[PDB]
Paper text:
pmcA Disintegrin and Metalloproteinase 8 (ADAM8) is a transmembrane protein belonging to the metzincin superfamily of metalloproteases. ADAM8 is activated by autocatalysis in the trans-Golgi network and, for in vivo activity, requires the homophilic multimerization of at least two ADAM8 monomers on the cell membrane. In this context, the binding of a bifunctional ligand to the catalytic sites of an ADAM8 active homodimer on the tumor cell membrane could efficiently reduce ADAM8-mediated tumor growth and invasion to the surrounding tissues. In particular, we chose to dimerize the arylsulfonamido-based hydroxamic acid JG26,14 which has already been reported as a nanomolar ADAM17 inhibitor with a good selectivity over MMPs and ADAM10.
Considering the good fitting in ADAM8, JG26 was dimerized in the P1 position through the insertion of a N,N′-bis(carbamoyl-propyl)-isophthalamide spacer to give compound 1. X-ray crystallographic analysis in MMP-12 cd taken as model metalloprotease and molecular modeling studies in ADAM8 cd validated the design of 1, driving the synthesis of two other analogues bearing linkers of different lengths. Crystallographic analysis showed that the crystal of MMP-12 in complex with compound 1 belongs to space group C2 (cell parameters a = 51.291, b = 60.39, c = 54.00; β = 115.23°). The bifunctional inhibitor 1 (assigned occupancy 0.5) crosses the crystallographic two-fold axis of the MMP-12 homodimer, generating a trimeric adduct: MMP-12–1–MMP-12. In detail, the two hydroxamic acid groups of compound 1 chelate the two zinc ions of the MMP-12 homodimer, thus orienting the 3,5-dibromobiphenyl groups into the S1′ cavities. To verify if this arrangement could also be plausible for the ADAM8–1–ADAM8 trimer, we aligned two ADAM8–JG26 complexes on the MMP-12–1–MMP-12 adduct, maintaining the same N,N′-bis(carbamoyl-propyl)-isophthalamide spacer present in 1. The obtained complex was then subjected to 1.051 ms of MD simulation to analyze the stability of the trimeric complex. After ∼500 ns of MD simulation, the system reached a good stability, with the α-carbons of the two proteins showing an rmsd of ∼3.5 Å and the heavy atoms of compound 1 with an rmsd of ∼5.0 Å, thus confirming a good match between the experimental MMP-12–1–MMP-12 and the theoretical ADAM8–1–ADAM8 3D disposition.
Author numbering: 105 to 263
């Protein structure tokens, strides 16, 4: 566990929006995903619309400028870079997935919670109950909650 952000106020910017979803729903999903982590750390997240943010949120398909191409529908859903300058922190979502607010397709909020974990410096957990487990699993709004392992992991980096 190398890089962590050495400041409490972190910015994000949505570079572009998936056509799979309502704009407001993309905004809300991402916002709620950041809140999951601010809930258990001293971190504060603010959305900006211009300039350089710490965490750029991108929807893209195939080769998209960073040596780690996406693979079409299925397989890899998203990836994110650990804390650092430039691409550090950034979270990319595979546009070849079909992003949703619900159980259909791939759930943006759940995926974003996982990716933002990486953006903050977390790796993968071996606990199949943890949001940082390496394989996506759909959990509804009644069931999602950060596992104790996720909480232990993030507080070992920030609190
Ligand atoms: Ca960045
Ligand atoms: Ca994919
Ligand atoms: Ca799509
Ligand atoms: Zn990428
Ligand atoms: Zn991951």
């Amino acid at each position: 566990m190398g890089p962590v952000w050495r400041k409490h106020y972190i910015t994000y910017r949505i570079n572009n929006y998936t056509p799979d979803m309502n704009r407001e729903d993309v905004d809300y999903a991402i916002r709620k995903a950041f809140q999951v982590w601010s809930n258990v750390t001293p971190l504060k997240f603010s959305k900006i619309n211009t300039g350089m943010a710490d965490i750029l949120v991108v929807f893209a398909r195939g080769a998209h400028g960073d040596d780690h191409a996406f693979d079409g529908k299925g397989g890899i859903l998203a990836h994110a870079f650990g804390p650092g300058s430039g691409i550090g922190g950034d979270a990319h979502f595979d546009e070849d997935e079909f992003w949703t607010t619900h159980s259909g397709g791939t759930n943006l909020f759940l995926t974003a919670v996982h990716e933002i974990g990486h953006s903050l410096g977390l790796g993968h957990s071996s606990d199949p109950k943890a949001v940082m487990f390496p394989t996506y699993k759909y959990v509804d709004i009644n069931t999602f909650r950060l596992s104790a392992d996720d909480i232990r992991g993030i507080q070992s980096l920030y609190g």
